[PDB]
Design an enzyme around this catalytic site. Sequence first.
Site, mmCIF file in Angstrom:
data_model
loop_
_atom_site.group_PDB
_atom_site.id
_atom_site.type_symbol
_atom_site.label_atom_id
_atom_site.label_comp_id
_atom_site.label_asym_id
_atom_site.label_seq_id
_atom_site.Cartn_x
_atom_site.Cartn_y
_atom_site.Cartn_z
ATOM 1 N N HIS A 96 0.833 -1.188 0.000
ATOM 2 C CA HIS A 96 0.000 0.000 0.000
ATOM 3 C C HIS A 96 0.867 1.237 0.000
ATOM 4 O O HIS A 96 1.955 1.251 0.583
ATOM 5 C CB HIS A 96 -0.950 0.032 1.201
ATOM 6 C CG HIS A 96 -0.266 -0.022 2.532
ATOM 7 N ND1 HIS A 96 0.393 -1.142 2.987
ATOM 8 C CD2 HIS A 96 -0.202 0.886 3.535
ATOM 9 C CE1 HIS A 96 0.830 -0.925 4.216
ATOM 10 N NE2 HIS A 96 0.480 0.297 4.572
ATOM 11 N N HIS A 98 1.028 5.242 0.950
ATOM 12 C CA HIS A 98 0.420 6.263 1.793
ATOM 13 C C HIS A 98 0.394 7.596 1.053
ATOM 14 O O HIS A 98 1.365 7.957 0.398
ATOM 15 C CB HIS A 98 1.254 6.488 3.061
ATOM 16 C CG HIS A 98 1.309 5.313 3.984
ATOM 17 N ND1 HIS A 98 0.467 5.180 5.067
ATOM 18 C CD2 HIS A 98 2.137 4.242 4.018
ATOM 19 C CE1 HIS A 98 0.775 4.079 5.730
ATOM 20 N NE2 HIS A 98 1.785 3.491 5.115
#
Lengths: 149, 149
Positions: A96, A98
């Site tokens: 992922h 940010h």
Amino acid sequence: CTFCSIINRELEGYFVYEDEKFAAILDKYPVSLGHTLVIPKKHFENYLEADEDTLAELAKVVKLVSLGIKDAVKADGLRLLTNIGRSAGQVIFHLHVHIIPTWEGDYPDIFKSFKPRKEQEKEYYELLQKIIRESIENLKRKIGDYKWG
Amino acid sequence: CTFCSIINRELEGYFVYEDEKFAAILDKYPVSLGHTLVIPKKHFENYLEADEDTLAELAKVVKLVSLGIKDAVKADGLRLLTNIGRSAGQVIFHLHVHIIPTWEGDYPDIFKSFKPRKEQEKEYYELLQKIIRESIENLKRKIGDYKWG
Ligand SMILES: [Zn+2]
Ligand SMILES: [Zn+2]
């Protein structure tokens, strides 16, 4: 996996973007207002384990979502990052990226009390999701594959 | 521009990777041993100003260089990041991705004294460049377009 769970609707998460292979979800314990995570739906331990096609499309989704968030919360800047390994600060082992908004001053008045690094009140997630979605939709209309103004 | 200058050899910089459109250069004031910057040769103010094709290829170069650095300095982890805007910490306005190595303990013995966040002695740049290049070359031989072992 926390992200696979959110993708499968087994765990609560507020989506601000989603397509067949990617999604962007508001961070539950945001560092700053509008903090969002962009993820490939397919599970990869980290950035280094993902194939090139996934990474290429991920980069494009990150751009779109970042533009959307910057517009929605009127940010002056954005910090983009991804961690590989616990020693680099990784705690959720599902790739992922940010997107953490920043401001030279303070965030917009339209937004109320915000508690950095903590879980926010339900109202925060509902409002941020709605305004970010609205900004992204506009970006698809003026610079999307079928833009027209 | 500091990066355009390094690309044009008008300013000193140690390349660890380079092709027709991208390059990876050792950070002059490294946060950690092996800290490297991956950049598109074409000048873009930040991540949001780059076209999708550049961002897609940039992501692929970042993966290769990251794998190379992790192997070369035997890192346990890596922090990847890019900043957009001064309020997000951006100071060089030429799109670049930071690859900052991390360890659960201490970095390899083969490496000598390191002064975090400061300019290192010439020896540091020469050694890091050579070992990282060596690791990347191997990655091209075992997982490159013309890999064979
Ligand atoms: Zn997962
Ligand atoms: Zn430049």
